Amino acid sequence: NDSTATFIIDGMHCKSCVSNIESTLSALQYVSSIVVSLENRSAIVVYNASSVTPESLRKAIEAVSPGLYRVSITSEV
Ligand SMILES: [Cu+]
């Protein structure tokens, strides 16, 4: 059973950006589903996390618009 995280990407006005980001999220060597939301500001992913930093996947956002996208994470570490 997997760790489902949400990253809330307040990036641009469209937030279309999320799926551009999902392409990175859904390519990592530890993930079983990609589940983003663009009209909103959401990127959701099924993957391996807890005793390893979930903030890993945040770098997908940070690499397309560093210092810009207000991405907020559901985590506990
Ligand atoms: Cu956008």
Side-chain angles (χ1 to χ4, degrees), residues 11-18 38 69:
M12 228 297 185
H13 300 289
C14 49
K15 293 74 69 289
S16 306
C17 302
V18 310
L38 88 88
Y69 297 173

Side-chain angles (χ1 to χ4, degrees), residues 1-21:
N1 201 343
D2 287 286
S3 273
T4 299
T6 294
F7 308 66
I8 293 314
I9 307 162
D10 256 317
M12 228 297 185
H13 300 289
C14 49
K15 293 74 69 289
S16 306
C17 302
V18 310
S19 157
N20 138 91
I21 268 136

Side-chain angles (χ1 to χ4, degrees), residues 5-77:
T6 294
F7 308 66
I8 293 314
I9 307 162
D10 256 317
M12 228 297 185
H13 300 289
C14 49
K15 293 74 69 289
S16 306
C17 302
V18 310
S19 157
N20 138 91
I21 268 136
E22 100 206 339
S23 210
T24 308
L25 298 176
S26 189
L28 306 179
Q29 60 130 114
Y30 56 87
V31 23
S32 239
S33 189
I34 172 273
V35 239
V36 318
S37 320
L38 88 88
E39 67 308 311
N40 274 272
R41 41 201 165 166
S42 328
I44 303 93
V45 184
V46 167
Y47 76 110
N48 305 154
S50 53
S51 64
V52 293
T53 48
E55 312 309 324
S56 286
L57 272 64
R58 198 173 180 275
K59 285 87 200 91
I61 292 60
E62 298 170 263
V64 65
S65 297
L68 218 186
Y69 297 173
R70 291 161 163 259
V71 73
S72 298
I73 289 71
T74 61
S75 67
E76 44 172 19
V77 57

